[PDB]
Nucleic acid binder design. Structure first.
Ligand SMILES: CCC[C@@H]1C[C@@H](C(=O)N[C@@H]([C@H]2O[C@H](SC)[C@H](O)[C@@H](O)[C@H]2O)[C@@H](C)O)N(C)C1
Ligand SMILES: [Mg+2]
Ligand SMILES: [Mg+2]
Ligand SMILES: [Mg+2]
Ligand SMILES: [Mg+2]
Ligand SMILES: [Mg+2]
Ligand SMILES: [Mg+2]
Ligand SMILES: [Mg+2]
Ligand SMILES: [Mg+2]
Ligand SMILES: [Mg+2]
Ligand SMILES: [Mg+2]
Ligand SMILES: [Mg+2]
Ligand SMILES: [Mg+2]
Ligand SMILES: [Zn+2]
Lengths: 206, 142, 165, 36
RNA sequence: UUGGCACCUCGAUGUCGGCUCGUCGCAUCCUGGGGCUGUAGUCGGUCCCAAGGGUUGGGCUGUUCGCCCAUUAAAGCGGCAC
RNA sequence: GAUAAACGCUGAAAGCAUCUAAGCGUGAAGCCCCCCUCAAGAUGAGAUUUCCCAUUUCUUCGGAAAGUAAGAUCCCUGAAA
């Protein structure tokens, strides 16, 4: 199981050798370093901690500087753990390049979905509108809060509230191209998040 | 008038270690509840906590008579519609015995703020080893 | 119960070990039921007379008898494939049956059981542990149990299959 | 299988037994299988 | 369900159908497992286990219901102030 | 992985028989996992890595207050929020 951290650059399309045209997400994954290895003896579980993008000194504090000094590297914007990896691979301070993947590798992409702010039940939960005419005064409303008997509302009556900005995993995206000199992965289809969003690419759990 | 009342930290609370191997789940629990509550001390004061600390070891070997291992069901409700989960006493004695004994003893403690303090004095271990050697626990017989 | 030549029946507390020529067995019996060892003969001791003990008695006898006869001459359950294109093959340690399915069905015998196949139309299951022979033989029969209309499928060699139109 | 509160021998071959605290009759004739 | 009674509510407990939102039971409509069959096969019948998910769009009528058209794996039956 | 109905193996009680009493196996879209998300206010408040260090004057006493460290905020430019 291999893993890397990249930024979503954007979407485009590529023609396959076949001739088919496929949509791709461009993930730029430069400056991934191995910062720490967690073992069962020390931490209670196997994981490798990867630091992604380089960050100006004045944006880092002394606690951060002390943690990346152990891996002889500069402060890092994003630090994430990968579990289910082989710790025998990964030396502390080693770069992690996008060539840990190959064209045809099936990956899971994890990121935070775009923020839509306060949203109603129609957009947030795909509920149906009431009629728009025939005397209706019920358009974009949540529906009955429930029956009478329990003198209260059950605990998953879906209602308006803040919509996106959740963690999302898309499973089984094909890697379409790996460009090491550009530190670029091309992934078939889309991954969560706005442009410039952290994307965690790891080998498909399935 | 003149009846004695224990003050907090007046009565010496002792540490006891009790082997659960073979004893009916209740029977163990009912005796332990009395020790936690302090019902075995003449200084017993209903509002204070004069009881002792209890370590139970070998909770995995606790006794369940009849078909209780398969037929005694422990229920939890999440408070979500249809959120009732169930476990057999048997499965719980195999995988989470610390939980089994805590459920059994919690039910036999007073249902109040002091009852919740008494529960904090109970330490259950599936096996034979605890990490409370510093507290110099004394073996207790039922 | 009579012990034959080569058989060494020992007793370690409640559990009996019976090592013979064909193989070796270890079966744990109920404590209170006590079993007496002698140079040639074995007798079982029923202490009290309660439904529990009356039963266990006959079982501890039966199983010990089975164990002992198990390591002496042994146990052979024999199966008989019926139906056009039903054939058994023996390739290594895998009994490969072709019994009318789109896939072939394969069986690896456990530790002590052996599946020799004289003819393609019949199978035989040798072993010392009688229940282990019983189970494997049943598991093989389970693949295509005899059907009532043309009697096709895997039967035991003595089995009496009910027949319909 | 016949599942019914009244379980009883339907022919001379029918045997009444108990499995797992359930009365049943087993028989050579499969029509006579009954569980209570 | 059709009822019986008149115990809460007449200083008001809004009453049918639909819409929105469901949630629960299982006496299961589909899908899963299985026994018997007057089970050759393909289809079925009947019973047992099973409530995870699923369980259509129209014509007529205020309707519920029902009939019909066309589908569907299936077009379940009930409770929650019908 | 463990089970339901069910099917068995071995097997007495009950010289037979019997899936069951002791003992083994098979066996469901269901149960528990596996998959996705939240989650230590899990007051039972967990763990790992890293950073700062032992200041001053009072307080009989316990403790208090008042400059700071690492770090954070106010304020300001904003949006991917
Ligand atoms: C078969 C009906 C049985 C009776 C119904 C109910 C009643 O009187 N409802 C009032 C209601 O009028 C308005 S709704 C328009 C009010 O807002 C509402 O609160 C309420 O008073 C009116 C409809 O008659 N009674 C308690 C029992
Ligand atoms: Mg937004
Ligand atoms: Mg609509
Ligand atoms: Mg309007
Ligand atoms: Mg209430
Ligand atoms: Mg009257
Ligand atoms: Mg009023
Ligand atoms: Mg049912
Ligand atoms: Mg109309
Ligand atoms: Mg109504
Ligand atoms: Mg038998
Ligand atoms: Mg299994
Ligand atoms: Mg499915
Ligand atoms: Zn009969």
């Amino acid at each position: 199981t291999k893993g890397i951290l990249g930024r979503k650059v954007g979407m485009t399309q590529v023609f396959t050798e076949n001739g088919e045209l496929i949509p791709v997400t461009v993930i730029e994954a430069a400056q991934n370093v191995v910062l720490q290895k967690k073992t069962v003896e020390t931490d209670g579980y196997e994981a490798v901690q990867i630091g992604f993008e380089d960050k100006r000194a004045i944006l880092s504090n002394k606690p951060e500087q002390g943690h990346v000094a152990k891996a002889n590297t500069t402060p890092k914007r994003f630090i994430r753990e990968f579990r289910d990896v082989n710790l025998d691979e990964y030396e502390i301070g080693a770069e992690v390049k996008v060539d840990v993947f190959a064209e045809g590798d099936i990956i899971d992409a994890t990121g935070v979905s775009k923020g839509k702010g306060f949203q109603g039940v129609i957009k947030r939960h795909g509920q149906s509108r009431g009629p728009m005419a025939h005397g209706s005064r019920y358009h974009r409303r949540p529906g009955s809060m429930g029956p009478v008997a329990p003198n209260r509302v059950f605990k998953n009556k879906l209602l308006p509230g803040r919509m996106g900005g959740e963690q999302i995993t898309i499973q089984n995206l094909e890697i379409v191209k790996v460009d090491v000199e550009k530190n670029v992965l091309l992934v078939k289809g889309n991954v969560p998040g706005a442009k410039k969003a952290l994307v965690q690419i790891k080998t498909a759990t399935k | 008038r003149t009846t004695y009342m224990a003050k907090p930290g007046e009565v010496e609370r002792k540490w006891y270690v009790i082997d659960a191997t073979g004893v009916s789940l209740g029977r163990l629990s009912s005796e332990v509840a009395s020790i936690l509550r302090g019902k075995n001390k003449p200084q017993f004061t209903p509002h204070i906590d004069t009881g002792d600390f209890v370590i139970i070891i070998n909770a995995g070997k606790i006794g369940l008579t009849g078909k209780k291992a398969t037929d005694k069901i422990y229920y939890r409700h999440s408070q979500y519609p249809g959120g009732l989960k169930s476990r057999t006493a048997g499965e719980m004695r195999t995988n989470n015995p610390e939980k089994l004994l805590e459920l059994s003893i919690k039910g036999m403690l007073p249902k109040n703020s002091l009852g919740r303090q008494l529960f904090k004095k109970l330490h259950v271990y599936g096996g034979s080893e605890h990490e409370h050697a510093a507290q110099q626990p004394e073996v207790y017989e039922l | 119960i009579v012990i034959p030549a080569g058989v060494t029946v020992t007793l370690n507390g409640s559990t009996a070990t019976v090592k013979g020529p064909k193989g070796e067995l270890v079966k744990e019996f109920n404590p209170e039921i006590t079993i007496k060892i002698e140079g040639n003969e074995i007798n079982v001791s029923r202490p009290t007379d309660n439904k529990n003990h009356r039963a266990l008695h006959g079982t501890t006898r039966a199983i010990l008898n089975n164990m002992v006869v198990g390591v002496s001459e042994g146990y052979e359950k024999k199966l008989e494939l019926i139906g056009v294109g039903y054939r058994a093959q023996k390739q290594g340690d895998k009994l490969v049956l072709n019994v009318g399915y789109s896939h072939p069905v394969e069986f690896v015998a456990p530790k002590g059981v052996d599946i020799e196949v004289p003819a393609n139309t019949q199978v035989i299951v040798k072993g010392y542990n009688k229940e282990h022979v019983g189970e494997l033989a049943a598991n093989i029969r389970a693949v295509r149990p005899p059907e009532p209309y043309k009697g096709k499928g895997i039967r035991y060699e003595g089995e009496h299959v009910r027949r319909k139109e | 299988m016949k599942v019914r509160p009244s379980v009883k021998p339907m022919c001379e071959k029918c045997k009444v037994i108990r499995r797992k605290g359930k009365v049943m009759v087993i028989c050579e004739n499969p029509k006579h299988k009954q569980k209570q």
